[PDB]
Design a protein around this ligand. Structure first.
Ligand SMILES: *C(=O)C[C@@H]1O[C@@H](C)[C@@H](O)[C@@H](O)[C@@H]1O
Ligand SMILES: [Ca+2]
Ligand SMILES: [Ca+2]
Length: 114
């Protein structure tokens, strides 16, 4: 199944934040309505924040997260969780190698803001 794709309510601000846990340099792209809206790159084996950004979900609300390492697309896992019928997390893990810890780049999307 498709992973890393989330339908947010339209014209809603959301945060996106990436963490790195790999020897490979992680590149994270965030697409709103299939248009690159933010990109983060960095390397860490200690969960360093490699980027954080506030975005608007636009007319569509379609947000997609992509992860690659030196150009090679990582395998993604994702899900959305809603707490007390209000607070939204869209979560992404990624695997760039063979050990399958799926933390090589970790991306957290959250809304509402403000
Ligand atoms: C490359 O060595 C693989 C890679 O980096 C490791 C340090 C570890 O984070 C592993 O999960 C990652 O796939
Ligand atoms: Ca890994
Ligand atoms: Ca890792």
């Amino acid at each position: 199944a498709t992973q890393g794709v989330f339908t947010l309510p339209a014209n809603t601000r959301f945060g996106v934040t990436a963490f790195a846990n790999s020897s490979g340099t992680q590149t994270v792209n965030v697409l709103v309505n299939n248009e690159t809206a933010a990109t983060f790159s960095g390397q860490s084996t200690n969960n360093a924040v490699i980027g954080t950004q506030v975005l608007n979900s636009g007319s569509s609300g379609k947000v997609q997260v992509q992860v690659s390492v030196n150009g090679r697309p990582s395998d993604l896992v994702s899900a959305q969780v809603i707490l007390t019928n209000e607070l939204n997390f869209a979560l992404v893990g990624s695997e760039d190698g063979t050990d399958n810890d799926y933390n090589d780049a970790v991306v957290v999307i959250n809304w509402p803001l403000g």
